Design an enzyme around this catalytic site. Sequence first.
Site, mmCIF file in Angstrom:
data_model
loop_
_atom_site.group_PDB
_atom_site.id
_atom_site.type_symbol
_atom_site.label_atom_id
_atom_site.label_comp_id
_atom_site.label_asym_id
_atom_site.label_seq_id
_atom_site.Cartn_x
_atom_site.Cartn_y
_atom_site.Cartn_z
ATOM 1 N N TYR A 61 0.823 -1.199 0.000
ATOM 2 C CA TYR A 61 0.000 0.000 0.000
ATOM 3 C C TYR A 61 0.860 1.253 0.000
ATOM 4 O O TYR A 61 0.680 2.122 -0.865
ATOM 5 C CB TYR A 61 -0.978 -0.026 1.180
ATOM 6 C CG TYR A 61 -2.024 1.062 1.098
ATOM 7 C CD1 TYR A 61 -2.428 1.566 -0.128
ATOM 8 C CD2 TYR A 61 -2.579 1.605 2.244
ATOM 9 C CE1 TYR A 61 -3.369 2.562 -0.211
ATOM 10 C CE2 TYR A 61 -3.521 2.604 2.171
ATOM 11 C CZ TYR A 61 -3.912 3.079 0.941
ATOM 12 O OH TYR A 61 -4.854 4.078 0.862
ATOM 13 N N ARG A 85 -4.312 13.246 -6.344
ATOM 14 C CA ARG A 85 -3.397 13.454 -5.228
ATOM 15 C C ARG A 85 -2.910 12.097 -4.724
ATOM 16 O O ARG A 85 -3.461 11.542 -3.778
ATOM 17 C CB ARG A 85 -4.071 14.252 -4.114
ATOM 18 C CG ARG A 85 -3.116 14.867 -3.110
ATOM 19 C CD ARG A 85 -3.046 14.034 -1.845
ATOM 20 N NE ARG A 85 -4.374 13.726 -1.324
ATOM 21 C CZ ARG A 85 -4.625 12.755 -0.454
ATOM 22 N NH1 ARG A 85 -3.639 11.991 -0.005
ATOM 23 N NH2 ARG A 85 -5.865 12.545 -0.034
ATOM 24 N N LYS A 104 -5.143 -0.936 -1.668
ATOM 25 C CA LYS A 104 -5.969 -0.692 -0.490
ATOM 26 C C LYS A 104 -6.892 -1.868 -0.202
ATOM 27 O O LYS A 104 -7.055 -2.268 0.955
ATOM 28 C CB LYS A 104 -6.780 0.584 -0.670
ATOM 29 C CG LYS A 104 -7.469 1.038 0.590
ATOM 30 C CD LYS A 104 -8.181 2.348 0.374
ATOM 31 C CE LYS A 104 -8.438 3.041 1.688
ATOM 32 N NZ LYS A 104 -7.177 3.487 2.334
ATOM 33 N N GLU A 145 -10.788 7.684 -2.498
ATOM 34 C CA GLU A 145 -9.388 7.489 -2.169
ATOM 35 C C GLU A 145 -8.509 8.247 -3.152
ATOM 36 O O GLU A 145 -8.714 8.176 -4.365
ATOM 37 C CB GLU A 145 -9.057 6.001 -2.183
ATOM 38 C CG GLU A 145 -7.904 5.613 -1.306
ATOM 39 C CD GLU A 145 -6.611 5.669 -2.059
ATOM 40 O OE1 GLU A 145 -6.660 5.480 -3.289
ATOM 41 O OE2 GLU A 145 -5.558 5.895 -1.427
ATOM 42 N N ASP A 146 -7.533 8.977 -2.616
ATOM 43 C CA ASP A 146 -6.594 9.795 -3.387
ATOM 44 C C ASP A 146 -7.289 10.814 -4.277
ATOM 45 O O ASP A 146 -6.798 11.128 -5.364
ATOM 46 C CB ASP A 146 -5.645 8.939 -4.228
ATOM 47 C CG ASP A 146 -4.483 8.406 -3.421
ATOM 48 O OD1 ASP A 146 -3.792 9.192 -2.745
ATOM 49 O OD2 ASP A 146 -4.236 7.196 -3.481
ATOM 50 N N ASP A 149 -10.582 8.041 5.157
ATOM 51 C CA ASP A 149 -9.507 7.677 6.075
ATOM 52 C C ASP A 149 -8.750 8.903 6.568
ATOM 53 O O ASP A 149 -8.367 8.978 7.740
ATOM 54 C CB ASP A 149 -8.548 6.696 5.406
ATOM 55 C CG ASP A 149 -9.115 5.307 5.326
ATOM 56 O OD1 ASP A 149 -9.954 4.970 6.182
ATOM 57 O OD2 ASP A 149 -8.721 4.550 4.418
ATOM 58 N N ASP A 150 -8.504 9.865 5.682
ATOM 59 C CA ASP A 150 -7.688 11.011 6.067
ATOM 60 C C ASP A 150 -8.412 11.893 7.076
ATOM 61 O O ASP A 150 -7.803 12.404 8.020
ATOM 62 C CB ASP A 150 -7.280 11.802 4.825
ATOM 63 C CG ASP A 150 -6.367 11.008 3.910
ATOM 64 O OD1 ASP A 150 -5.129 10.966 4.182
ATOM 65 O OD2 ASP A 150 -6.866 10.424 2.925
ATOM 66 N N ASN A 155 1.763 13.209 6.556
ATOM 67 C CA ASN A 155 2.660 12.371 5.781
ATOM 68 C C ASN A 155 2.658 12.843 4.333
ATOM 69 O O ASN A 155 1.707 13.512 3.908
ATOM 70 C CB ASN A 155 2.239 10.895 5.866
ATOM 71 C CG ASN A 155 0.782 10.684 5.526
ATOM 72 O OD1 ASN A 155 0.056 11.635 5.241
ATOM 73 N ND2 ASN A 155 0.343 9.432 5.557
#
Lengths: 551, 551, 551
Positions: free
Chosen positions: A90, A143, A161, A233-234, A256-257, A399
């Site tokens: 991942y 992103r 993922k 996601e992203d 998640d973020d 991160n």
Amino acid sequence: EKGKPLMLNPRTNKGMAFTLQERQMLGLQGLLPPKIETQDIQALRFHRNLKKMTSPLEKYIYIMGIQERNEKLFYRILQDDIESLMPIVYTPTVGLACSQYGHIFRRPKGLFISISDRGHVRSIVDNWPENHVKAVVVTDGERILGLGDLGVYGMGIPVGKLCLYTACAGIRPDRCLPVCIDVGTDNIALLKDPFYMGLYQKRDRTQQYDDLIDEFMKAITDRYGRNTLIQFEDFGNHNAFRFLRKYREKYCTFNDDIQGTAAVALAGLLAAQKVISKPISEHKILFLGAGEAALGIANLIVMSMVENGLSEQEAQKKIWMFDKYGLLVKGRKAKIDSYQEPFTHSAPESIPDTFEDAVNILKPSTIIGVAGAGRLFTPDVIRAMASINERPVIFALSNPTAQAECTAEEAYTLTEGRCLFASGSPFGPVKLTDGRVFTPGQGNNVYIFPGVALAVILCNTRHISDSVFLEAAKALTSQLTDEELAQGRLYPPLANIQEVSINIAIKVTEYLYANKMAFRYPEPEDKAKYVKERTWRSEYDSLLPDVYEWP
Amino acid sequence: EKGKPLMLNPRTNKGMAFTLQERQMLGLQGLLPPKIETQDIQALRFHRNLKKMTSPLEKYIYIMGIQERNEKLFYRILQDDIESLMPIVYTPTVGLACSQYGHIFRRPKGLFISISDRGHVRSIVDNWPENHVKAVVVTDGERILGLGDLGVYGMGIPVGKLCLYTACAGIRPDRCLPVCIDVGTDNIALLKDPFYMGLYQKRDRTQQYDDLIDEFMKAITDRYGRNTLIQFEDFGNHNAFRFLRKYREKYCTFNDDIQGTAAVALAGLLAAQKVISKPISEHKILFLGAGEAALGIANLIVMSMVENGLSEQEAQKKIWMFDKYGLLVKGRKAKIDSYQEPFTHSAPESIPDTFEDAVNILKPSTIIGVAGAGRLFTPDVIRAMASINERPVIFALSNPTAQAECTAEEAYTLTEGRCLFASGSPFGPVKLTDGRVFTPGQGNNVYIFPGVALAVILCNTRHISDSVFLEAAKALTSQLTDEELAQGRLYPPLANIQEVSINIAIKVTEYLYANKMAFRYPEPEDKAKYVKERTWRSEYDSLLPDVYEWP
Amino acid sequence: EKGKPLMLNPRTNKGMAFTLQERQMLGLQGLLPPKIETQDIQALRFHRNLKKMTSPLEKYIYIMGIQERNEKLFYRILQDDIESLMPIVYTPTVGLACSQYGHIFRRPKGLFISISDRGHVRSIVDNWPENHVKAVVVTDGERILGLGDLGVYGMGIPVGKLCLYTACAGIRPDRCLPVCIDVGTDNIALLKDPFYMGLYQKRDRTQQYDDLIDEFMKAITDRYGRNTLIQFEDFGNHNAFRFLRKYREKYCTFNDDIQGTAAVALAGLLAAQKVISKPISEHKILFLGAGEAALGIANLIVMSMVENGLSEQEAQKKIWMFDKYGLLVKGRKAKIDSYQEPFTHSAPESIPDTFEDAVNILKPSTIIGVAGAGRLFTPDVIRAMASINERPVIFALSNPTAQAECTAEEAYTLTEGRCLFASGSPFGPVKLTDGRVFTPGQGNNVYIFPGVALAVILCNTRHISDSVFLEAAKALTSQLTDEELAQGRLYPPLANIQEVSINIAIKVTEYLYANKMAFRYPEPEDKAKYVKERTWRSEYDSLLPDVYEWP
Ligand SMILES: NC(=O)c1ccc[n+]([C@@H]2O[C@H](COP(=O)([O-])OP(=O)(O)OC[C@H]3O[C@@H](n4cnc5c(N)ncnc54)[C@H](O)[C@@H]3O)[C@@H](O)[C@H]2O)c1
Ligand SMILES: NC(=O)c1ccc[n+]([C@@H]2O[C@H](COP(=O)([O-])OP(=O)(O)OC[C@H]3O[C@@H](n4cnc5c(N)ncnc54)[C@H](O)[C@@H]3O)[C@@H](O)[C@H]2O)c1
Ligand SMILES: NC(=O)c1ccc[n+]([C@@H]2O[C@H](COP(=O)([O-])OP(=O)(O)OC[C@H]3O[C@@H](n4cnc5c(N)ncnc54)[C@H](O)[C@@H]3O)[C@@H](O)[C@H]2O)c1
Ligand SMILES: NC(=O)c1ccc[n+]([C@@H]2O[C@H](COP(=O)([O-])OP(=O)(O)OC[C@H]3O[C@@H](n4cnc5c(N)ncnc54)[C@H](O)[C@@H]3O)[C@@H](O)[C@H]2O)c1
Ligand SMILES: NC(=O)c1ccc[n+]([C@@H]2O[C@H](COP(=O)([O-])OP(=O)(O)OC[C@H]3O[C@@H](n4cnc5c(N)ncnc54)[C@H](O)[C@@H]3O)[C@@H](O)[C@H]2O)c1
Ligand SMILES: NC(=O)c1ccc[n+]([C@@H]2O[C@H](COP(=O)([O-])OP(=O)(O)OC[C@H]3O[C@@H](n4cnc5c(N)ncnc54)[C@H](O)[C@@H]3O)[C@@H](O)[C@H]2O)c1
Ligand SMILES: O=C(O)c1cc2ccccc2c(Cc2c(O)c(C(=O)O)cc3ccccc23)c1O
Ligand SMILES: O=C(O)c1cc2ccccc2c(Cc2c(O)c(C(=O)O)cc3ccccc23)c1O
Ligand SMILES: O=C(O)c1cc2ccccc2c(Cc2c(O)c(C(=O)O)cc3ccccc23)c1O
């Protein structure tokens, strides 16, 4: 199936683990090498081969190659060495692999949905073979973590993922669907080369993008049901943050973020309140950066304080935030959003422009850095943080490692082992000159999102609330033993995440059944056995049909 | 098929060359990236990627990866860059890849037949999907070219060989079947490691091996017909040589090392008789090493002399042989086989023990080295060879380069450009100090076996005679233009082998129909058009069904 | 296949003859009744059920129902009771079933090709599953035997005909393809009802019909090869007769009414020359009706006379013909076609208008009626025929029974047992008042076309000559034993047609290999074993894969 298709299908393929009888009576005799192996021999072979490899990209190519051949072997290998292979699968390896190698997969994984396919998304969704899918992960490619815009090449990210979903939580692989929605790319490198496999246009930022997302969600929930778990996601920060708010109530979506990171941070704080005698309620918290992530973390912290008896308005007074312009106070020159209002308080005496003097005057017991503009935490910040507090709590949750505010060595050397440091990015153990090697707490979302996803799937939940992640954070804090707390560890060891995730699922499942958020009835008598039955297991299943002789 | 299987099948897969209409009405919409490409774009993409790669193993892995995904694209890439990629596909790269990487292929290719499967080989053969196969290549794994015994890992060799069948000759890929018959392995490295996928026993040299070969040939000809072309590849020298004699009359079998190499050597000699004024009949020939390969070459040379008017018994007097012990003469101490009798003559005056004095006394016009015991040709040998003959002909046909008797630099420097040098191993052009860069003739079997195989398949030939390779050698010599002969080239350029192979097929086909060896009737009026229609072409075929509206 | 499809496919279905092991390991356990039967029990059940039935239509529905469920059982039932069930399958029952019940079949049999599908016939042909078909039977529906124009409902006729191919000759069922080409219908009954499943237009008699036939033949030979046997069945007399002449040389076509009927008539005459001492050459022949059928019969008779030493021009002088207008003579008022010229001779003294006086003056030894305008043979005709000849030969070859010129009772009562009577229509045995029950010879095409078709298919013949049917007639005459000749039988018993047909095939095969008309090489050493191996057999084949344990 029978014969060659049985070998070609990754779900049903056993490799040379097909027993001689299965080969003979399934048409595989002569199509496989004479050796007959077990799942252990196959796992040992791949473990040795991976140990020979020296770079993350080689390991990634190898394991994603075995995934397309044998899925049960792939997940057996993952679960055998989950701590080592999880960064390979991942983060940050899959993004770098998408950057360099482009498209690795030799088989159709997930669905590619274009902006040119608007008005016909349901036709695309109908093409997916599996009729029941429970989890959908959607990527924009805008992103990627540390790599930027990758266009349509960011399709490996949902695959990586979902691998974690199956490896940690135990969600069935065929219940997962990776989707890449491509509306162009902004980076000129992909727009220039003639072999880019996506659209040759800049990213569509008009209303067509929003309409395409709406149509995709409608089509996917129409085919697979309203309780389908859809995870964005992203996406870009703007896009993901606004999409979560838009689709949070109507669909089963969690980010998640915003939410997983908040749960991990709260779990770290709840573990620190066990390492340190003083509880979570007493100690004041200062946030570096005010945004949807910071607001989510602060809201979840306020919820944790409230469930411990503190008044909500009184609990909010303890959390402080530091925007880009300065300390978030009444009468500030810069505008304050409606969501940032609860945590904006009366200005102190100093009203400091710099973060350093804000730490000095506010005397914060806990400092959390989410801004991610660089190494915002300075040695002066850390020594000041040590000055006020005997055992300061320092969080650097942004991160990649470049964006992280603090480094483990900086935190553990500027503070002579007194601080508790937790960061999203992985850091090696810090060995002080005196001694007392300190390993910094590394809290990533993989603690939270597999177990929460499994609990949501099993209970047929249609709307994921904020307090679900509060229960997940409490559950995650619970598995820490007293010996680990004496060692100073903020998070459970990452080598046994599966037993963690299942446990988290259990607790979340109970909460979902306590507050009428679960639509799977009748209620299980005990939730632990209920979830433990449902988890997918990588053991091979015999394909021999039952043969007997009539009496 | 429709939908996902259509993508998974390499035969029918088009990749992103599926047009939008085909994707929409075949169920592939959303399973493929939005880009729509042609076969040219796909070929250019892979050519650039291969050009970026620096080592033969990386190129081999890449191309054999694209083979399992899209076969038409793979053969388009091969035919586009056949000269460069042919060493990558067949020799010496595939043997080294089997040595290092073991099993590369992710899909079932060919059949694995064990010694433990004796008595049931037909059951194994019945498992192969394709009902009509025309060519079968069988490997034992005992003698890989330059790598030794590889056991069951020598299965990539028939795959690489059949790739050349399809790329050069045009034989349909689904008509080819690679077979690996494994009876153990002699090398201890594979017997020791626990992850070797073959039998854990030493190679079976008993009668069971012969019975297994008999049973396999019977089963394969029973299922696929008596005219199936079966080629024994990388067997031991003893096994392959005796199997060719045993099965030559009953089955359609031909051996490249015995017969293809002889055809290539004879073609080189027939081209030399055009470069040099004197014909093949006049000039005396000396062989280094007497064996089945040397006997085959000498027999074919005698046939060529005979068809030019020379008496067979008189033609045999010109060919001389040098065994391991010494010159092959009457009254020799060592035994002389029945097959070596025709070329054994009355002893000369010297009766030399060494090859050097044999060259000195016999005054050979042509020297051919097939012994392959090392660098048997010495600088003294070559300067002596130049001394007698103004334009000596030197052949070093044994491969690999280590086993070759002579080197291109040695031949072209010891002889100041006067000699004609042809070798099986590839050598770079030789640049003399004076100048006149000389490229040495490099004659490999790929000139012969594709065209001969295609001609045999098309004419339904059941028994391949020795003179078929005589016709193939004459045909191969024919494509050389007068400009190339002026340049001194013994073989046609390797960059346009396809147009060579087809031409060879034409000639061979004519011969097969001239001498009642062809069982495909009615006879084609012209053989060129007949063979040119039948060759498989890598162009994609549209899958759109015909749509119209009734009148 | 496996599981339910294995039951649904008629080719692979076994019914309850699946053994318990096959049911258990093929996925059929629980999908079939518990009883396990053999091929014999199933055949006996259906034989008893058919014996209970009382009408041909019920039997036809029953047997064509079992055909769609189990083909091997269906052909076992046919071969068990071929004499009784052959009228049920082909004639006259299938035409009447198409007339009454319309479309009976529940499964797609053959191809429907429209006049509206012109320009795209190859697309239709590509839809047929089986890749190799050897025999194609094409129906127009225009002229069903005794029922007239049936439009698209005449599709059961080719199915019934191919059933006879498989039952008698042994041609594989999957090698046969029934095709119905519909260009409209002339009968108003089908054009009026709204549920007719064909085109609602009158039959297309324009050039589009010819172009459609050309395109269909081109497409079918393009897909299946130039040696495909195509048979035009139940076309109009004009259409069929001209199509045979047009496509006879370019394609492999033969017509039963022109050529099979001629072969049967010649076989009857060759058997009569054994019953009667005098040979075929001596005795004069008179034909009622001059047409393509009569011309074919007379040409074949002339060929038989020629091979026995008689001159062709001299042999033609013996055959006489009676057109509609009158005796076919020089100077006749009505036009005489080019094909009718050889059999037109100098006028006799009488030049009779009526057929009766033609018999009286010509003194014909043999009389053959093919006109089919009704009961043209009268009691006066038959008593006159007896007057000249001690043992007259009377043939009434036109069918149905209504169109037949003579009746068995009329022939055997007007002539007190002296005559030899052969007719296409079936007639019961005639019992005279004195005694000596006489069964009339009944010669139908089923003697000829199965064996000839099998011989043509096996030898890969591309052009069927006229003398092939001469060899077939001689072969058919050969199986008659001396006891049957003493009984006075002109044709072999119909109960053992299979052993007849195979024998015929043998002889025809030999002829095809004697005169270079056969393109299947190498030549079989003995033709009998060659054909006997190739015939399809209705015995079930075990589907158990071979299971063993490795040594
Ligand atoms: N050989 C097979 O693949 C096989 C065989 C039997 C059953 N199944 C599966 O069992 C399902 C029956 O559903 P149930 O009776 O268990 O419902 P359930 O009452 O046990 O659970 C409720 C929901 O949770 C889902 N779910 C359960 N376990 C899951 C997991 N490990 N991963 C992802 N989602 C999960 C279920 O699909 C269901 O929608 C079938 O629909 C089929 O998907 C698969
Ligand atoms: N996926 C994850 O691991 C994850 C999850 C949540 C948050 N984060 C981290 O949160 C941080 C940003 O996330 P976000 O949702 O708040 O983005 P955002 O766009 O919503 O806002 C970022 C905030 O950072 C503040 N800020 C920026 N630069 C600053 C500076 N030099 N000094 C002081 N304040 C500054 C700004 O005031 C701004 O409000 C990053 O470290 C990001 O990596 C990461
Ligand atoms: N879409 C397809 O894959 C497709 C379509 C149509 C036909 N075909 C092939 O055409 C064949 C018909 O045979 P034919 O009429 O051409 O026989 P033919 O008379 O033209 O040639 C005689 C023999 O040569 C074989 N042969 C011909 N070309 C070959 C080639 N390029 N590679 C290997 N073997 C070859 C043939 O199989 C045949 O056995 C079918 O059996 C089928 O194999 C394939
Ligand atoms: N696949 C190919 O490219 C190919 C084909 C044919 C021949 N060859 C070459 O032929 C040569 C051997 O093939 P083979 O079929 O004859 O093997 P073989 O076992 O049948 O006999 C080899 C012969 O070489 C002779 N010999 C060996 N060492 C000698 C020495 N030091 N001095 C003189 N003579 C010596 C021996 O007398 C022996 O007869 C090798 O170079 C081999 O690589 C290669
Ligand atoms: N389980 C099966 O269905 C099965 C198994 C094996 C072979 N076959 C058949 O055997 C064929 C091989 O051909 P061959 O070697 O026998 O050619 P052949 O040399 O024996 O005969 C020449 C021609 O006669 C045809 N033919 C032979 N027998 C026939 C029959 N009973 N009915 C109709 N046509 C017939 C053949 O198709 C061939 O074209 C395969 O193409 C396949 O059709 C079928
Ligand atoms: N499928 C079969 O069983 C089969 C095969 C061949 C012939 N036949 C029979 O042949 C006869 C006609 O076939 P055809 O090919 O010659 O058709 P056709 O159209 O080619 O010609 C029929 C001939 O019959 C003659 N004729 C008609 N009425 C006559 C009459 N009242 N008196 C004397 N002569 C008369 C005509 O002169 C005409 O030439 C029919 O009995 C037909 O059933 C049947
Ligand atoms: O699981 C599977 O479906 C599977 C399928 C196989 C099919 C053929 C041969 C080996 C297979 C192996 C083992 C295997 C490999 O898998 C790999 C690899 O994956 O690179 C390399 C090998 C090298 C030597 C020997 C075995 C190797 C498998 O496991
Ligand atoms: O032909 C095929 O079936 C085929 C199937 C594909 C399926 C999905 C994506 C690309 C495909 C490509 C192109 C392609 C590739 O093939 C490869 C590769 O093979 O490594 C790498 C790519 C990297 C970036 C973009 C395209 C790449 C193909 O050609
Ligand atoms: O061969 C076959 O695939 C076949 C398939 C069958 C499937 C289920 C039951 C009987 C089957 C029979 C036997 C059978 C029948 O077939 C028929 C019928 O055909 O009317 C009627 C039956 C009445 C009672 C008992 C058995 C009967 C078959 O033979």
